[PDB]
Amino acid sequence: FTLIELMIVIAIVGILAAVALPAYQDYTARAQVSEAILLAEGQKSAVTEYYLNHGKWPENNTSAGVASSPTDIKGKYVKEVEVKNGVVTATMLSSGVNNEIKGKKLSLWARRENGSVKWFCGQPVTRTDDDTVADAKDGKEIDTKHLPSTCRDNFD
Template sequence: MRKAAGFTLIELMIVVAIIGILAAIAIPAYQNYVVRAKVAEGLTYADQAKTSVSEYYLAGNTWPSTNASAGLPDTLAGNYVSNVQVGVSSGVSTVTVLFNSSVVSGLTVVFTPVASGGTVAWSCSTDAAYAQYVPSSCH
């Protein structure tokens, strides 16, 4: 008699079930990682704008009100960023990063400066619904 070799149907079904469970866990984690990587592009553009705003303030002790006054292009955009805008809120400049809808629809990150003793520190805020996509300092 010949000895049977190979996998039984039950063994193959168990392997398929295990792969399905692993995929159910891995795919959402990967999607979150992809969005966070896209948000990182916007934070890089924001760093450029924050540096310009800080230099403007330290040179003249006033805040710039537009991208142009901060020495930035009117449209500062990238693959996942629709624009980075310098504006004024409550007498202080803000840097607002607007993301394309391909990243997360409605996601904006706002950086607000605090000047103290010849230095400028920045705080970050975003809507709580998007907290999982931004650095912990923005919560």
């Protein structure tokens, strides 16, 4: 008799295929989500640049002083980056992951804090007035798993 040695194999054969794969396609997503964020990094100061030397958030790329077409600004897994009244929205590409990101959006949320500006990523938002921003709940919210933790920040 050895079969229980075969049993235990077929217990090892049925693997978990750990959630540490899909929580880390969600954090592999955090990698290329970050690839969208690292794009946003450029616009942080450029959007800021318009905001400081013209006194309002730039509507759009042309005003921000970046590639007027957003799609030109893009990432290995990122589709485009649009300026939206200061709020920097980034759209993801299609396949490259299985994960529920494909074409989904990220936004980056600024706010003056006694001058000192405050950048929160995450849940898509959109600006309407100098400090007023709205939760831009359009169904392009990349899920909170995917997203950062420091930036898991909606419109406060």
